[PDB]
Amino acid sequence: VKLPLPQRLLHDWANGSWVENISVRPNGNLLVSTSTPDGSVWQIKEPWKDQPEVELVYNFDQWVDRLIGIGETTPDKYVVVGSRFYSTDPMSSHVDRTFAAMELDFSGSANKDKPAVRLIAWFPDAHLLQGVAALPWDRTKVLISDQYLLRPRAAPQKDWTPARGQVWTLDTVTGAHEVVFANDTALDTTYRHGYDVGINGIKIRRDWLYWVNSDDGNIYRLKIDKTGHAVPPAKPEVVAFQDTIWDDFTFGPEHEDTIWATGFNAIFAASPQGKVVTVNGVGTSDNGIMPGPTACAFGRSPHDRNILYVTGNMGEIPVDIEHVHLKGWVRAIDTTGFHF
Ligand SMILES: *[C@@H]1O[C@H](CO)[C@@H](O[C@@H]2O[C@H](CO)[C@@H](O[C@@H]3O[C@H](CO[C@H]4O[C@H](CO[C@H]5O[C@H](CO)[C@@H](O)[C@H](O)[C@@H]5O[C@H]5O[C@H](CO)[C@@H](O)[C@H](O)[C@@H]5O)[C@@H](O)[C@H](O[C@H]5O[C@H](CO)[C@@H](O)[C@H](O)[C@@H]5O)[C@@H]4O)[C@@H](O)[C@H](O)[C@@H]3O)[C@H](O)[C@H]2NC(C)=O)[C@H](O)[C@H]1NC(C)=O
Ligand SMILES: *[C@@H]1O[C@H](CO)[C@@H](O[C@@H]2O[C@H](CO)[C@@H](O)[C@H](O)[C@H]2NC(C)=O)[C@H](O)[C@H]1NC(C)=O
Ligand SMILES: C/C1=C/CC(C)(C)/C=C/C[C@]2(C)Oc3cc(O)c(=O)cc(C)c3C[C@H]2C[C@@H]1O
Ligand SMILES: C=C1C(=O)C=C(O)C(=O)C=C1C
Ligand SMILES: [Ca+2]
């Protein structure tokens, strides 16, 4: 019960890189998506080792300059989303109407070390695809969060009008996709936290869509039906509050309904009743050791279920968003024995 929790560094990428999200394979290897300097998935094999192997899986340049979110669908298949971007600068806007969803298929004899990769669907009317979460009762379908600038442009960006946030469904078998939830301020930003997004990372648990909002401090959930639409009256519910810039989160370990969420240079745990504790990073004796965490996920091997693996994209604590020093990293946090 001593805080902060124990942590160690698995791997650093080079200056300028950005590790944006993470999915754990059934065999326990990590798959991480990068936004810069290119849009790729990397694998950390056997991440419980002191010095695990880190290998490029696939660079998605054929379709996109950057990847954002990743999520597992059916076992050992993954959906990533991405688009073209005006530049590799940390402040670069996306290029409107270039978003896409792609698949990495590790399932089956032929693919379990070299995956088969394909383009699933173009999303030219989306704004910025962000987080990906499979419907647990129908795992070939995912929800995808979507929010950022309505009018992204080449630098200097001057019109920062935000698009209203929304949630898509995507059928990875047929490629069919549509918006299933939109036009609710819980999905939106008004830049209370500076330039940012509204709805960011998503996860689905039982018949609830959960998400964090990077601008209003809230973790939300929404009751959904089996096609992903909201169950009337369709009103999001606050599950927790903390005045921090949320990015992504997970439930765990194992079957526990505790939320582990990345915040502003810090990691947080939130009880289902709304109690929020800072367990790593800024606000503990960790200080600035983990700048810019972006996502987290628990280990899946029989011998690391309590290890929370954390992706990040900064090499120093930023003074302001216009002076970011990008550097991708992955750390591992030992949550063994944590309780509220
Ligand atoms: C949540 O709520 C929203 C809001 O109600 C719902 O979205 C609307 O859905 C309806 C029904 O499907 C859409 O109506 C159709 O619109 C068609 C034309 O759409 C195209 O033009 C739109 C207007 O463009 C002008 O205004 C915008 C906003 O100010 C400017 O940015 C733009 O530059 C244009 O400005 C010029 O013209 C106006 C005059 O209109 C002048 O005042 C200006 O000075 C300029 O001269 C535009 O908003 C649309 O963009 C949106 O959608 C596209 C997808 O096509 C997407 O790629 C964009 O990123 C953006 O999201 C689009 O370019 C028309 O042909 C058709 O007959 C019908 O009228 C309506 O467009 C939607 N409105 C918005 C704001 O999105 C939404 O459905 C709902 N969600 C759910 C799940 O219910
Ligand atoms: C990666 O970026 C860091 C800064 O985030 C670089 O570190 C700086 O290096 C200069 C010149 O060597 C020093 O004057 C600064 O004091 C350093 N700042 C630090 C350490 O915070 C680092 O050199 C970069 N790496 C490479 C290979 O270029
Ligand atoms: C990626 C992005 C891009 C949009 C743009 C171009 C305006 C950048 C803003 C930088 C910003 C505000 O920086 C943070 C910094 C950290 O230090 C940290 O620990 C945690 C978070 C969660 C964030 C998230 C991002 C916000 C947005 O999601
Ligand atoms: C807003 C985003 C975001 O949230 C995350 C990303 O990975 C990224 O590459 C940058 C954009 C602009
Ligand atoms: Ca994110």
Give me the domains of the chain, ranges plus CATH numbers: 7-334 (2.120.10.30)
Nearest to 314 by CA among 269, 278, 264, 268: 264
Write the CA distances from 67 to 193, 199, 302, integer angstroms.
24, 17, 30
| Atom number of ligand 1 nearest to Cα 127 | 59
Under 8 Å between Cβ of 67 and 81: yes
**What is the rounded distance in angstroms from the CA atom of residue 187 to the CA atom of residue 164?**
7
Bridge partners of residue 224, in order along the sequence? 230
Q: Report which DSSP code applies to 207.
A: T
The amino acid at 185 = T
Q: Would you say how long the chain is, in residues?
A: 340
Q: Cα–chain-centroid distance for residue 115?
A: 21
Cross-sheet strand order for the sheet of 166-171? 129-135, 138-146, 166-171, 177-182
**What is the rounded distance in angstroms from the CA atom of residue 181 to the CA atom of residue 297?**
25
**What is the rounded distance in angstroms from the CA atom of residue 273 to the CA atom of residue 184?**
23
Bridge partners of residue 298, in order along the sequence? 308
Separation of CA 318 and ligand 2 centre (Å) = 14
- Ligand 4 binding pocket includes 172 (Cβ within 6 Å): no
In sequence order, the 6+-apart residues with CB closer than 8 A to the CB of 296 are: 22, 248, 249, 250, 260, 261, 262, 267, 308, 309, 310, 311, 333
Q: Report which DSSP code applies to 149.
A: B
The percent helix, strand, coil of the chain (3-state, each to 5) is 0, 50, 50
Ligand at shortest distance from the CA of 245: 3
Write the CA distances from 200 to 11, 159, 216, 321, integer angstroms.
25, 21, 12, 17
Q: Report which DSSP code applies to 54.
A: E
Ligand 4, atom 12: closest residue by C-alpha = 93
The count of C-alpha atoms lying within 13 angstroms of the C-alpha of 269, restricted to the half-sphere facing its C-beta, is 20
Nearest to 41 by CA among 27, 196, 25: 25
Separation of CA 315 and ligand 2 centre (Å) = 10
**To one decimal place, what's the resolution in Å?**
1.9
The count of C-alpha atoms lying within 13 angstroms of the C-alpha of 335, restricted to the half-sphere facing its C-beta, is 29
The amino acid at 10 = L
| Atom number of ligand 2 nearest to Cα 15 | 1
Angle at 81 between CA 214 and CA 67, to 5 degrees: 80
CA torsion, points 27, 33, 39, 43, in degrees to nearest 10? -30
Nearest to 4 by CA among 267, 250, 331: 267
In sequence order, the 6+-apart residues with CB closer than 8 A to the CB of 15 are: 315, 325, 326, 327
H helices within the chain, ranges in order?
Answer: none
**What is the rounded distance in angstroms from the CA atom of residue 312 to the CA atom of residue 243?**
20
Separation of CA 52 and ligand 5 centre (Å) = 25
Radius of gyration, alpha carbons of the chain: 18
Which tokens sit at 329?
A: 């990293």
The count of C-alpha atoms lying within 13 angstroms of the C-alpha of 145, restricted to the half-sphere facing its C-beta, is 30
In the block, which residue shows the tokens 């379709």? Answer: 63
Burial class (CB in 10 A: 0-12, 13-18, 19+), 328: buried
**What is the rounded distance in angstroms from the CA atom of residue 188 to the CA atom of residue 249?**
18
In sequence order, the 6+-apart residues with CB closer than 8 A to the CB of 320 are: none
Residues in contact with ligand 1 by the CB-under-6-Å rule are 125, 127, 179, 182-183
Which tokens sit at 11?
A: 């791997």
SS3 state at 187: helix
Which tokens sit at 191?
A: 């830049």
SS3 state at 59: strand
SS3 state at 109: helix
Residue to probe by mutation, ligand 4, list 70, 148, 214, 313, most atoms within 8 Å of CB: 148
